[PDB]
């Protein structure tokens, strides 16, 4: 006996969307499950979640601008850590607002 | 006892070795330099990191000497008629092998280095093929040594 | 002067003992299998290449040569 | 301050490797009397008498290594002194 | 303190130190000479005085002597046999190492008594270090015994004269003049044997003291 | 045989480097022996690295 | 099949046999430990030099190569084209003027001369560890340092092709495909072994077959293989190896 490639197989998944937000958050926290696309013929922008996509984009742009400001302020970062501190509220939207 | 015109072939081999080796290294430096000039306008920060083929041309150069110093040290003012033709063959073989390896390494390096200026990550296969062209020169040095063995 | 049976015997027992005893003394673990494989592999490659290395000087078919300064020097050297 | 560690770490490692190399080499020249197995070339032409002058010449050859070894100690000292400046 | 000075450990350790600094020191500077003559049939070509010197590390294998060949006025060089610097070099080099370690141990005894009486752990280190040194002393004593016996029936003039290629012809008579003196060899092996047995005694005392 | 070739080439290039740098540094006088060893050995180090 | 666990070792030792220098291996291991002991200090640092990023990404590979280069340098008994007196000389050619019929022709004359292994009192057994330094001091050392290293590299490659072949049979065990094994794998192993096993056994036998007293009528090194493939077996000077080998 020796070590071959590992073992894994497709298993379906039912989940209510409201709890699915937190479900996929946790699944990504674990990092140990693949993902795939089940609706290939539809366009990426036709998935209708592009609203979340471009609001992510605009927070990204705002954060880039304040990053440039801080680089002009020449204030170094400290990296306190605590990597798992990303919660799941809708309060993030008006916080970034 | 021996016939005259003994050292002629030995010295001729010694000269031809370096002449052809230097000529190959010259063409290598040619192609490399013009390639760096070609790419540098848009990627000024890759210029130091894109300096591979020239030092490889210098490795064909250090090969030139290892063979030049060997043939020079073996040279004396007396030959048994066996080392004369031997030295000539060694010099011709090593010189032209350096020439051909320099030609290959130069043009392929120019093409590759001036091509990676757009796509960064393909850069490694350039060194792969380049140093295969270098192992060609290594084979040249091999035959030089086995020829000086006798 | 030197022997061949004594050196070949001592080193083959050394490396064979290393290889055979390798797997057993390791405690149970997930790193155990890979360690066993690399230990047996290094044992075998080292041992075979050592066999050819020691055979390199066995039953010579030709006698080396030397210089004349080397003649007198080696004559007045060891032994 | 002057002569920062960026341009002196190379000097430190070079001096360390050089002192160890030179000390071992001098040990080989002295103790082994420079057997041909470790050192073929010499500096003389006439050996009419015997090995005593060869041994003496190898003794002074082994002596010649100490000066360079101490020089490398001195270079390492200067390099480390420059590194200590910050 | 004086209590440990009166304790056998300090006196005993100092005793082995003085025995060693006598023994290996004398071993490192021994020397001697033996004399020979090859009084061939012709007085003009005969040899009456030959000197050959032996000295530390006792590498008899490259010792030699140049004597007239007695054939038409020639001369030949002949080299003795026997390589004894392996065992001897091992013994003296490791004896120097043991001397340095003895200096360190004595320094720890006299200056670091407080760090010596803590946890009774360093005594164990000293114990197995001395045990390795004692095993070494035994094996090197055996090697030196075999070496000195080999030297004993190697330096005998019968071996070299039967090695003399040109003494087989009539008229080539050759008598040893001054025989070699081997006081150094048996004195030194006696010194080493005393050191070995006394280090064994030290080991036993340390085994009885570390409790 | 190309592994053998690389090993051969390495051995001979190291030998010629030794004969070119270290062997030429051999003279009786200590005045230059203890001084020029600096630059000859620095050259050896740079060439090998 | 995952050949990676075996590759863990199979890479560094080839790197080492190619890289035949002890001291260079010491320097490589010095660099490797300088990187490894600075693991955390390098994790905190950012790899601005991407070449250094690749170098760090495989330290373990680097230190494996370093250790195996040290090992190869040790067993070669070569270090910057020099060797040190560790074991005995292992030749001990004392009789040259005596037992060998020579007195004096040195200096201007007899500059170079070969010695006869046949004469007794000149052989000191094989050198226990590594190449005998007689080759290091010798002038035509390269002539025969070719031959055994040639054969050595060949032997190595043959062994590797052997177990590499066996791996495919293992693969076919785990797929349960005897269709491609019955008229398949076994013929490959027979075809490969019949030639390379023959070559390696020929060489092991040739090594200890003959001695210095039969040197000037001994078999060649490789020409007999060429004759074997040529189908031509003249009896003139047939250097017979074992009885009935035809």
Swiss-Prot record, chain B:
It is a multi-pass membrane protein. Residues 72-87, 148-150 are lumenal. Proton-conducting pore forming subunit of the V0 complex of vacuolar(H+)-ATPase (V-ATPase), a multisubunit enzyme composed of a peripheral complex (V1) that hydrolyzes ATP and a membrane integral complex (V0) that translocates protons. V-ATPase is responsible for acidifying and maintaining the pH of intracellular compartments and in some cell types, is targeted to the plasma membrane, where it is responsible for acidifying the extracellular environment. Keywords: Cytoplasmic vesicle, Hydrogen ion transport, Ion transport, Membrane, Synapse, Transmembrane, Transmembrane helix, Transport, Ubl conjugation. The chain crosses the membrane at residues 6-28, 51-71, 88-109, 127-147. Residues 29-50, 110-126 are cytoplasmic. This is V-type proton ATPase 16 kDa proteolipid subunit c. The record marks 134 as: Essential for proton translocation. Pfam families: ATP-synt_C (PF00137). SUPFAM superfamilies: F1F0 ATP synthase subunit C (SSF81333). Belongs to the V-ATPase proteolipid subunit family. One of its GO terms (cellular component) is vacuolar proton-transporting V-type ATPase, V0 domain. GO terms for molecular function: P-type proton-exporting transporter activity; proton-transporting ATPase activity, rotational mechanism; ubiquitin protein ligase binding. GO terms for biological process: lysosomal lumen acidification; positive regulation of Wnt signaling pathway; synaptic vesicle lumen acidification; vacuolar acidification. The keyword Hydrolase does not apply.
UniProtKB/Swiss-Prot annotation, chain C:
V-ATPase is a heteromultimeric enzyme made up of two complexes: the ATP-hydrolytic V1 complex and the proton translocation V0 complex. The V1 complex consists of three catalytic AB heterodimers that form a heterohexamer, three peripheral stalks each consisting of EG heterodimers, one central rotor including subunits D and F, and the regulatory subunits C and H. The proton translocation complex V0 consists of the proton transport subunit a, a ring of proteolipid subunits c9c'', rotary subunit d, subunits e and f, and the accessory subunits ATP6AP1/Ac45 and ATP6AP2/PRR. One of its GO terms (biological process) is synaptic vesicle lumen acidification. This is V-type proton ATPase subunit e 2. GO terms for molecular function: proton-transporting ATPase activity, rotational mechanism. The lineage of its organism: Eukaryota, Metazoa, Chordata, Craniata, Vertebrata. It is found in: Membrane; Cytoplasmic vesicle, Clathrin-coated vesicle membrane; Cytoplasmic vesicle, Secretory vesicle, Synaptic vesicle membrane. Residues 27-33 are cytoplasmic. Keywords: Cytoplasmic vesicle, Glycoprotein, Hydrogen ion transport, Ion transport, Membrane, Synapse, Transmembrane, Transmembrane helix, Transport. Glycans are attached at residue 68. It comes from the Eukaryota. It is a multi-pass membrane protein. Belongs to the V-ATPase e1/e2 subunit family. InterPro entries: ATPase_V0-cplx_e1/e2_su (IPR008389), ATPase_V0-cplx_e1/e2_su_met (IPR017385). PANTHER family: V-TYPE PROTON ATPASE SUBUNIT E 2, VACUOLAR ATP SYNTHASE SUBUNIT H.
From Swiss-Prot, chain D:
Pfam families: V-ATPase_su_f. Keywords: Cytoplasmic vesicle, Endocytosis, Endonuclease, Hydrogen ion transport, Hydrolase, Ion transport, Membrane, Nuclease, Transmembrane, Transmembrane helix, Transport. It is found in: Endomembrane system; Cytoplasmic vesicle, Clathrin-coated vesicle membrane. It is a multi-pass membrane protein. One of its GO terms (cellular component) is vacuolar proton-transporting V-type ATPase, V0 domain. It comes from the Eukaryota. The chain crosses the membrane at residues 9-29, 61-81. It is an enzyme of class 3 (hydrolase). GO terms for biological process: endosomal lumen acidification; proton transmembrane transport; receptor-mediated endocytosis; receptor-mediated endocytosis of virus by host cell. Its EC number is 3.1.-.-. Signal peptide: none annotated. GO terms for molecular function: RNA endonuclease activity. Endoribonuclease which preferentially cleaves ApU and ApG phosphodiester bonds. Hydrolyzes UpU bonds at a lower rate. Regulates the activity of vacuolar (H+)-ATPase (V-ATPase) which is responsible for acidifying and maintaining the pH of intracellular compartments. Required at an early stage of receptor-mediated endocytosis. Interacts with the proton translocation complex V0 of the V-ATPase. Interacts with ATP6AP1. PANTHER family: RIBONUCLEASE KAPPA. Belongs to the RNase K family. This is Ribonuclease kappa.
UniProtKB/Swiss-Prot annotation, chain F:
It comes from the Eukaryota. It is found in: Cytoplasmic vesicle, Clathrin-coated vesicle membrane; Cytoplasmic vesicle, Secretory vesicle, Synaptic vesicle membrane; Melanosome. Disulfide bonds: none annotated. Disruption phenotype: Embryonic lethal. Knockout embryos die at 5 to 6 dpc, before gastrulation. Predominantly expressed in neurons in the cortex and in the dentate gyrus, CA1 and CA3 regions of the hippocampus (at protein level). Expressed at lower levels in astrocytes, oligodendrocytes and microglia (at protein level). In the cerebellum, present in Purkinje and granule cells (at protein level). Residues 12-32 are vacuolar. V-ATPase is a heteromultimeric enzyme made up of two complexes: the ATP-hydrolytic V1 complex and the proton translocation V0 complex. The V1 complex consists of three catalytic AB heterodimers that form a heterohexamer, three peripheral stalks each consisting of EG heterodimers, one central rotor including subunits D and F, and the regulatory subunits C and H. The proton translocation complex V0 consists of the proton transport subunit a, a ring of proteolipid subunits c9c'', rotary subunit d, subunits e and f, and the accessory subunits ATP6AP1/Ac45 and ATP6AP2/PRR. Interacts with SPAAR. Belongs to the V-ATPase 116 kDa subunit family. This is V-type proton ATPase 116 kDa subunit a 1. The gene is Atp6v0a1. The chain holds residues 741 to 789 of 839 of the full protein.
């Amino acid at each position: 006996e020796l070590f071959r490639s590992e073992e894994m197989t497709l298993a379906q998944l039912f989940l209510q969307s409201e709890a699915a937000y937190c479900c996929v958050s946790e699944l990504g926290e674990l990092g140990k499950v693949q993902f795939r696309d089940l609706n290939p013929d539809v366009n990426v922008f036709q998935r209708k979640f592009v609203n979340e996509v471009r609001r992510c984009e605009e927070m990204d742009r705002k954060l880039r601008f304040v990053e440039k400001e801080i680089r002009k302020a020449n204030i170094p970062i400290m990296d306190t850590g605590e990597n798992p501190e990303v919660p799941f509220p809708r309060d993030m939207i008006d916080l970034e607002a | 006892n021996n016939p005259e015109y003994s050292s002629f072939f030995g010295v001729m081999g010694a000269s031809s070795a370096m002449v052809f080796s230097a000529m190959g290294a010259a063409y290598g430096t040619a192609k490399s330099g013009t390639g760096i000039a070609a790419m540098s306008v848009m990627r000024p920060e890759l210029i130091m990191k894109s300096i591979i083929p020239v030092v490889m041309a210098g490795i064909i150069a250090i090969y030139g000497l290892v063979v030049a110093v060997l043939i020079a040290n073996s040279l004396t003012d007396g030959i048994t008629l066996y080392r004369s033709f031997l030295q000539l063959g060694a010099g011709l073989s090593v010189g032209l092998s350096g020439l051909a390896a320099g030609f290959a390494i130069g043009i392929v390096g120019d093409a590759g280095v001036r091509g990676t200026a757009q796509q960064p990550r393909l850069f490694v296969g350039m060194i792969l093929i380049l140093i295969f062209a270098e192992v060609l020169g290594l084979y040249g040095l091999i035959v030089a040594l086995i020829l000086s063995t006798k | 002067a030197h022997s061949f049976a004594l050196p070949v015997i001592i080193f083959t027992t050394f490396w064979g003992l290393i290889g055979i005893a390798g797997p057993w003394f390791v405690p149970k673990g997930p790193n155990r299998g890979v360690i066993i494989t690399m230990l047996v592999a290094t044992a075998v490659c080292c041992y075979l290449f050592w066999l050819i290395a020691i055979l390199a000087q066995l039953n010579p078919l030709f006698g080396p040569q030397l210089k004349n300064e080397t003649i007198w020097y080696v004559r007045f050297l060891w032994e | 301050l002057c002569c920062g560690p960026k341009l002196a770490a190379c000097g430190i490692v070079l001096s360390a490797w050089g002192v160890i190399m030179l000390i071992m080499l001098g040990i080989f020249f002295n103790v082994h009397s420079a057997v041909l197995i470790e050192d073929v070339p010499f500096t003389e032409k006439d050996f009419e008498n015997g090995p005593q002058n060869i041994y003496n010449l190898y003794e002074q050859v082994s002596y010649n290594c100490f000066i360079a070894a101490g020089l490398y100690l001195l270079l390492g000292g200067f390099s480390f002194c420059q590194v200590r400046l910050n | 303190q004086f209590r440990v000075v009166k304790e056998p450990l300090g006196f005993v350790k100092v005793l082995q130190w003085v025995f060693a600094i006598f023994a290996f020191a004398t071993c490192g500077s021994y020397t001697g000479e033996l004399r020979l003559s090859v009084e061939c049939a012709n007085k003009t070509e005969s040899a009456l005085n030959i000197e050959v010197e032996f000295e530390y590390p006792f590498r008899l294998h490259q010792v030699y002597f140049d004597a007239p060949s007695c054939v038409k006025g020639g001369t030949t060089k002949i080299f003795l046999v026997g390589d004894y610097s392996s065992s001897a070099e091992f013994f003296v080099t490791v004896a120097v190492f043991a001397f340095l370690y003895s200096m360190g141990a004595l320094a720890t005894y006299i200056f670091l008594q407080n760090k010596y009486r803590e946890n009774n752990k360093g005594p164990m280190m000293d114990f197995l270090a001395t045990a390795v040194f004692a095993f070494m002393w035994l094996v090197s004593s055996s090697a030196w015994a075999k070496g000195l016996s080999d030297v004993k029936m190697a330096t005998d003039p019968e071996n070299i004269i039967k090695e003399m290629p040109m003494c087989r012809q009539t008229g080539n008579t050759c008598k040893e003049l001054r025989d070699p003196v081997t006081s150094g060899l048996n004195t030194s092996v006696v010194f080493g044997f005393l050191n070995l047995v006394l280090w064994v005694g030290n080991l036993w005392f340390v085994f009885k003291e570390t409790g | 045989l190309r592994l053998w070739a690389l090993s051969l080439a390495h051995a001979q290039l190291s030998e010629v480097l030794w004969t070119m740098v270290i062997h030429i540094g051999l003279h009786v006088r200590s005045l230059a022996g203890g001084l020029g060893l600096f630059f000859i050995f620095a050259a050896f180090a740079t060439l090998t690295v | 099949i995952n050949p990676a666990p075996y590759t863990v070792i199979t890479f560094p030792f080839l790197f080492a046999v190619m890289f035949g220098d002890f001291g260079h291996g010491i320097l490589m291991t010095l660099f490797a430990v300088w990187m490894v002991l600075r693991e955390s200090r390098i994790l905190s640092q950012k790899h601005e030099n991407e070449m250094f990023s690749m170098v760090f990404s495989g330290r373990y590979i680097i230190l494996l190569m370093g250790l195996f280069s040290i090992y190869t340098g040790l067993i070669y008994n070569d270090c910057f084209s020099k060797s040190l007196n560790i074991f005995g000389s292992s030749w001990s050619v004392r009789p040259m003027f005596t037992q060998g019929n020579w007195t004096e022709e040195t200096l201007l004359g007899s500059s170079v001369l070969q010695l006869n292994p046949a004469i007794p009192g000149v052989f000191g057994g094989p050198y226990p560890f590594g190449i005998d330094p007689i080759w290091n001091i010798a002038t035509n050392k390269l002539t025969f340092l070719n031959s055994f290293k040639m054969k050595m590299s060949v032997i190595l490659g043959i062994i590797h092709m052997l177990f590499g072949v066996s791996l495919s049979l293992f693969n076919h065990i785990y797929f349960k495909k005897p269709l491609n094994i019955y008229f398949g794998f076994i013929p490959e192993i027979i075809f490969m072994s019949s030639l390379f096993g023959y070559l390696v056994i020929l060489i092991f036998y040739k090594w200890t077959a003959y001695d210095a007293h039969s040197s000037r009528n001994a078999p060649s090194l490789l020409i007999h293989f060429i004759n074997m493939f040529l189908f031509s077996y003249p009896e003139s000077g047939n250097a017979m190896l074992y009885s009935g080998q035809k």
